């Protein structure tokens, strides 16, 4: 039984037809986050989506990816045993601090890039990167960041592109996805550009309350660096945002290239 090996304690978080609770593996004494999904509320198709997310999590072992340690199916309940990460989402911390210093944003994006690079080398594309699902080890400056929520992730064959469907989060969507073009790994680096812009000034590069006009902004790469807040941001921060928010997906910087950019490598 799940309850034979793990003891449940307090709720840490709440999803649709899911909760997250702190748990201890009894024999080990080790603490984990248990995502408990009510599979009574899911069709076969959506059960199988859950088993796919678990399988992709199992492929990925990396200090900046939330590690799935176990996946247990019981009558009406599925349990996903993750690393316990208690720092809350990157999103909440950006709102609390308003924006990050270049030193803190650089250390943050460097870890995201290592994680994305690992995903891309394993043939996994997240498709849905955003501060909302990047988890912090703590509220302390320089805290380790981890990628979470592989529920929309896909597997690609080498550098081959294909139409993998319309999915992700509106404000973070790549122009190639909005065009319905075949796509691959670069969609993640567009999302990294959006995340980096948000990190440095605390608002997104693309937004309109009209989703059509939001989508026209993204497809046209219509963002800028308004004064006064962007006046004190280094040209190299801007240059790395520009190479990530490149509409052409072949010209757009890769995770491997981003890790060599002077704003990452020459601190």
């Amino acid at each position: 039984r799940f309850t034979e090996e793990y003891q449940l304690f307090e709720e840490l978080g709440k999803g649709a037809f899911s909760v997250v609770r702190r748990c201890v593996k009894v024999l080990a004494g080790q603490e984990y986050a248990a995502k408990i999904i009510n599979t009574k509320k899911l069709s076969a198709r959506d059960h199988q989506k859950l088993e796919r997310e678990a399988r992709i999590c199992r492929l990925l072992k990396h200090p900046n990816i939330v590690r799935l340690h176990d996946s247990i199916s019981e009558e009406g309940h599925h349990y996903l045993i993750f690393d316990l990460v208690t720092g809350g989402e990157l999103f909440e911390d950006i709102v609390a601090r308003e924006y990050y210093s270049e030193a803190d944003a650089s250390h943050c994006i460097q870890q995201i890039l290592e994680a994305v690079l690992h995903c891309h080398q394993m043939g996994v594309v997240h498709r849905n990167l955003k501060p909302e699902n990047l988890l912090l080890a703590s509220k302390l400056k320089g805290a380790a960041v981890k990628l979470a929520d592989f529920g929309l992730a896909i597997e690609v064959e080498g550098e081959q592109q294909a139409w993998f469907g319309f999915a992700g989060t509106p404000g973070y969507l790549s122009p190639e996805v909005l065009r319905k073009d075949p796509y691959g790994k670069p969609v993640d680096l567009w999302a990294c550009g959006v995340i980096l812009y948000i990190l440095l000034v605390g608002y997104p590069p693309f937004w309109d309350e009209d989703q059509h006009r939001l989508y026209k902004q993204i497809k046209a790469g219509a963002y800028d660096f308004p004064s006064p807040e962007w006046d004190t941001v280094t040209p190299e921060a801007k240059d790395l945002i520009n190479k990530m928010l490149t509409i052409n997906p072949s010209k757009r910087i890769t995770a491997a290239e981003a890790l060599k950019h002077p704003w990452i490598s020459h601190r």
Binding site: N128, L152, F166, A167, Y172, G202
Partner: peptide, 17 residues
């Protein structure tokens, strides 16, 4: 700055609710 311009950072769900 974000606060002086009254800009907001608001969480977004995925397309696939």
């Amino acid at each position: 700055s974000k606060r002086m311009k009254g800009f907001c950072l608001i969480p977004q769900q995925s397309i696939n609710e």
